[PDB]
Amino acid sequence: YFPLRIYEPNELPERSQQLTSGDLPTLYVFSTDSDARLGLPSFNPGCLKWQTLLRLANLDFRILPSTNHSSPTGSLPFLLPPRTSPTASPAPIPASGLLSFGHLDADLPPRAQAYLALITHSLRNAWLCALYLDPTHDALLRRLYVDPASSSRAVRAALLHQLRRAAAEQVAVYRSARDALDALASLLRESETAWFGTERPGSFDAALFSYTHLMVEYMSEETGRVSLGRMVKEAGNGELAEHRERMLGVAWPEWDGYRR
């Protein structure tokens, strides 16, 4: 009742002035700032899925790397709407509501419901072991999840461990991934519609591209136990290889740089 004057709210600091103002919705993903400027796909599959989904929906946005603590839930890939009032912002959108913000999330025959459990529950594991557990790939995990975290060797050993432990319990398995990529290769050789039954790729093709792509880019290192980079291109007659290239001509029809 008493406060006498009102004096033009006080001009948020330089960090938030530069980062989170924007004009378009700024999706948060796991990425390196080198790719942020170019909108290139993420390196974590659980987020590249949603990113490929959105960019299929022809919605434009800007990717912006974050750190998985900054999220309304535990999981990262949440979208933020633009800034409408320079001192007050809208609410976040978790991963569950991006495709709310048709044919993408549609009911499929139970067969198509079945194979998706293969990818979510078997291919996901072979990824963790080949990345977070196999010591030969202690190099690539470093350049992705700890190297841009804090940059102080006293700290990096803490996060690098916190990941490997909290990821080991969540999962030998290499064989279960071997035949799985021969299964899907058969599911593709019987569709004849350039996708898994539908003319426009839906939520299943994007869920598979989430793994067929990363394992090609970051796991094709030839040095037994042939790395998953070759299994993806050798399963069947290479129908998983060509699928991505036919997929990576719709989501990002203007970018080159795949194939290692």
Place this chain on the structure above:
Amino acid sequence: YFPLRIYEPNELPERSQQLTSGDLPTLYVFSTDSDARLGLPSFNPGCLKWQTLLRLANLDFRILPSTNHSSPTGSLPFLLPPRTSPTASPAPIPASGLLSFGHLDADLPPRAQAYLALITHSLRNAWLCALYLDPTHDALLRRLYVDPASSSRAVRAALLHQLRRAAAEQVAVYRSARDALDALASLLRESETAWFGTERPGSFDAALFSYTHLMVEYMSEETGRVSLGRMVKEAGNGELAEHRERMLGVAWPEWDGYRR
């Protein structure tokens, strides 16, 4: 300022009406109520000393048994002056001020100062061991210090123990008492004044009567290690025996009942 009326203070209860009103000063000692009516000597020497002193000073009073918690200091034998106002009483007198309340407490030659350390420090011990430690005298200690305490065999075992422990640490020794009573017997055979140098018995004769008497009454049980009841009457030519009888003709010249 406000309290309107004043109404005749409220008539102290029956216990204190019967016990602690009195007319004469009521000295507190260790005793049994059977002797309280007759003013007979106490059974604890550390109090019989002061009692014999006072009754030598020709001061009249009434003995009254107590329990050694009721005392301004730890030690019991304190005297209480009479009641002058039925609701307010004077202050107690500890053991240090009774003979303040001439020849009794007078400076003696250092020789007489020497032997008194014998009695206070050697005869005192032989008393404790022969009473509080020797199991043959577990009967007499019972009838004195625990039997009139609470009269419940669940309790008596507690006090009886609390005494023996707190008395054992304060002190074999039987020999040191043997020759000591031959020492004093010589100190008496050289005085020729019926006392230890003085015509009227002073603080030394009363300090010795404190032990020469009790050990005769309560320790003359014949069943080696002849009890102290015989040592007192056999030391020298019995000059400690006759001394008490010559002493017990001044303090209580009208009572019979000594000699067991």
Place this chain on the structure above:
Amino acid sequence: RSLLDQIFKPVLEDQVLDRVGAATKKLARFDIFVKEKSRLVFSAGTDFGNAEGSAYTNAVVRNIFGGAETLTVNASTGTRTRSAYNATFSTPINGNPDLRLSVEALRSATQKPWASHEEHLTGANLRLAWLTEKGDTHALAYSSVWRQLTGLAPTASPTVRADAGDSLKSSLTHTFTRDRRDNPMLPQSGYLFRSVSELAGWGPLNGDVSFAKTEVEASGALPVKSGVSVGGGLRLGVLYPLPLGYSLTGAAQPSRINDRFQLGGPNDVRGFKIGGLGPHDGVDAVGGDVFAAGSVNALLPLPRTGPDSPLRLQLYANAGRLVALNSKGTDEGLAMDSAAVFKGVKSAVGKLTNGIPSLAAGVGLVYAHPVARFELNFSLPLVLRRGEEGRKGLQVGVGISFL
């Protein structure tokens, strides 16, 4: 399982009927809560480092076989001997959580400033906390204690210097309660009643002391929702000595200072020192045998605010008269035959009738917290018997039982 089966079957054996609420109350009575209540607790506030270790401790065990409970406390301070036995135990009896039982072996040093001494209890007891269905509670007890007095540090009295020994006091109480009160701390429209009648030493109940203490109570309230809430209060009490062996006539040793009523303080009769209104001996407050009490109250509600948060006003006018038992009759150390002691109390109750007893008066500010009751009164004692130590300032009162 049977613990709950025996109470489920009477419900299962029978428009619609709602008999399950009583079952829910039965379940809640067990103090075992349908999710959980807890498991054991603990603490050791263990100081150290000097002549004092101070050796704190605590423990709770909220279950052993299904419904039995325990406890423990300790302070082996190194200055006080110990409080090392304050352990309890609890168990329902053959079916219901009402007919509780218990065992405790207490040991403490109940310091008493008003009578300048201390007490050293080392006893053990045994309860039976039957709660009748209508709200009426009951109980029993059998508490053989030790009850030593050893704190006579300053000039105390030539009275509290006659009671320094020991005792047993194998009592057997019988509590009671008829609680219709609407709020346990703030009596607005409820009711109350009590009785604590114990028989200390007689016949089979052995020991040294011997009496039969009979304390009664009452209360009231009547709001004439204006929380006017007129008050009330009343108490009584009698300490009748008794012989020691299986009889009613014969010897009778009069009361001690351990077994006598003390009537005063911020919790019983506002407007007096923590111990007042007694057969005082100089500065020290010796209790009396027979006594009564009283009160009237107002408990005004804060006007122009309504029956809001518990805080209210208070306008009391207490009373009190704690006589002692003299004999002054048939004038043997301490041995009054049944004929004499009877004609003592019969006359030591006449002093209760005659005379305007005492009358405190004042105002206060009640704060009826859920677990306690804060008062912060201000009183002015009108009538007095000489040497009762009235008080006039701020009368800070805290506790659970008031008048």
Place this chain on the structure above:
Amino acid sequence: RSLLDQIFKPVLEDQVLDRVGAATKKLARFDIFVKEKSRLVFSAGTDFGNAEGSAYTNAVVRNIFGGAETLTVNASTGTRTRSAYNATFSTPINGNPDLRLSVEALRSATQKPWASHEEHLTGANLRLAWLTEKGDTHALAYSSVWRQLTGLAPTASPTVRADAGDSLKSSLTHTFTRDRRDNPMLPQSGYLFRSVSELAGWGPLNGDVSFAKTEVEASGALPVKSGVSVGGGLRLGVLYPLPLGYSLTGAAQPSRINDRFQLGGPNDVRGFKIGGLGPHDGVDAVGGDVFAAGSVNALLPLPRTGPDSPLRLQLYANAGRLVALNSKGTDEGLAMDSAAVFKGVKSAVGKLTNGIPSLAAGVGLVYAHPVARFELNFSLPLVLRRGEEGRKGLQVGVGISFL
């Protein structure tokens, strides 16, 4: 023995002269007190019995070799990870109790409601608490910490959702004090001065963040024994970013929300929410870089009573202006060269000069306890910049530092 011999000999080597009082003060400074101070202490408030053990702990060790001391705390609650490292250490250095030293390895969860997140410190530091003879204190530090933000539970902001990573911040402070104050809690006629200037990441001091925070202070008092005791107060502050490697020109990454000043609350500027007067983002209080402060005070003494017990009145008129550092200049993610950031603060200080900053006003009731200072004020914020969350009711203030 030599510990005291080295200070006895300068006294022994010399009507009468009284040079021993300084020796007594030296002895008292050791915190080792001539009878004793103490030996070790302890506690374990160890709960148990559920998904939480709560694992309290404590410890003190008031001597090891003669003057060295330690400490320890812990709460392994089972819900929070732990606070299991809060251990310290102390020791004089080569002769005197002034030039103290220390080591600590803290770990805590400094919860922040005003900015809806939390912090997880896991650092260790190293002090040097030189106390000059005249009363002027000094210090240093080197505190490599970890400083994680993970509490973004509710809708916080799109600002506090850009600062959720980690940091090192290998700082090096330098405290100060010139305390001439007559009563540490109640400034009546004394004085004050401070400085907390730290250099966070630069050259040898490595890590990720890089700045040089420079907080100043002042105070006053002047009773014109009428305890009129006119008041005073003033503060400042600057957060200047810096490059990362052994230079002064080049890259400079701007401030985070972990290193910025927050100006408000019952302890700094009365009359505002615990965090106010900032570059606010909706509901969440983001701190600003440059700021200033102020105050005036009255501290009236209770009239017709005199300079009695510490309690006094209080009539304050605060101020405050916490701007943030914008650039709006030479328009590379976050990399401002030295030329730009300089012309930023140089202009981001002009916003401090212009405009009536803010002006609280009210009355209060000080209670200058020996160890603390209770306020219980009541204020009314006159001037405001939109969205600063003024407050008007009862302004409950407690602590040691006020204005």
